[PDB]
């Protein structure tokens, strides 16, 4: 089927350049104008521009004319976009999407983050229930990922044993570093006789951290 393989995520220091990709496949590359959109989470979709690839011709929204520089390679069946002089506002998520009267097929989106803040592996802190506490049929555990950057981070419990009964709360930005947390609920019988562990992967910093949850 038609497919829009977008390039990997990206982090850049403000004021630097950045180039992005969108390998197209499954239809004649030439025949369809390709477009670019910008999504900033919790805000709407902003049309950046579009490039016809049969000739290289391009058309930009007024706003992005100085920022965005659209390119295409006919051999590669690839569309490119370049963003220069990056400034935080630019930090966001960028889709390439095919156009045939409407935006029928999209890529998955490359994700841009622009900051001075340097790459940091996360401190992981277990959340064993209160020293002084009353057990029930269900026990809730969790563990807390803190002080990591940049953002993509994922947590798997008992080595992926539990998908249900698991709550993952989205990250926030705390003093220029990210912080997230995860909840898991097993039965009272199950823990602590069994082992419950949260494994935390922060592939950005090439680091995974595994934490066995212990009671007191």
């Amino acid at each position: 089927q038609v497919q829009l393989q977008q390039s990997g995520a990206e982090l850049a220091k403000p004021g630097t350049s950045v180039k992005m990709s969108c390998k197209a496949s499954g239809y004649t590359f030439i025949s369809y104008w390709m477009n670019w959109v910008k999504q900033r989470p919790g805000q709407g979709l902003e049309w950046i521009g579009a490039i016809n690839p049969s000739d290289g011709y391009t058309e930009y929204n007024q706003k992005f004319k100085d920022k965005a520089i659209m390119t295409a390679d006919r051999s590669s069946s690839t569309a490119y976009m370049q963003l220069s002089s990056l400034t935080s506002e630019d930090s966001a998520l960028y889709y390439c999407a095919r156009y045939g009267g409407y935006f029928d097929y999209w890529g998955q989106g490359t994700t841009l983050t622009v900051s001075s803040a340097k790459t940091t592996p996360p401190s992981v802190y277990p959340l064993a229930p209160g020293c002084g506490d009353t057990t029930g049929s269900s026990v809730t555990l969790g563990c807390l990922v803190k002080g990591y950057f940049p953002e993509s981070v994922t947590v798997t419990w008992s080595s992926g044993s539990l998908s249900s009964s698991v709550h993952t709360f989205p990250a926030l930005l705390q003093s220029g570093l990210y912080t997230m947390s995860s909840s898991v609920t097993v039965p009272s019988s199950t823990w602590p006789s069994q082992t419950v562990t949260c494994s935390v992967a922060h592939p950005a910093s090439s680091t995974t951290v595994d934490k066995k949850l212990e009671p007191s």
Partner: peptide, 25 residues
């Protein structure tokens, strides 16, 4: 006999971009 027909030709290029509108009154 003869071989089958070759594949269909490549698809036309995306149409040229639309122009500026008429002036208002």
């Amino acid at each position: 006999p003869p071989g089958p027909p070759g594949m269909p030709g490549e698809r036309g290029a995306a149409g040229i971009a639309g122009p500026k509108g008429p002036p208002g009154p």
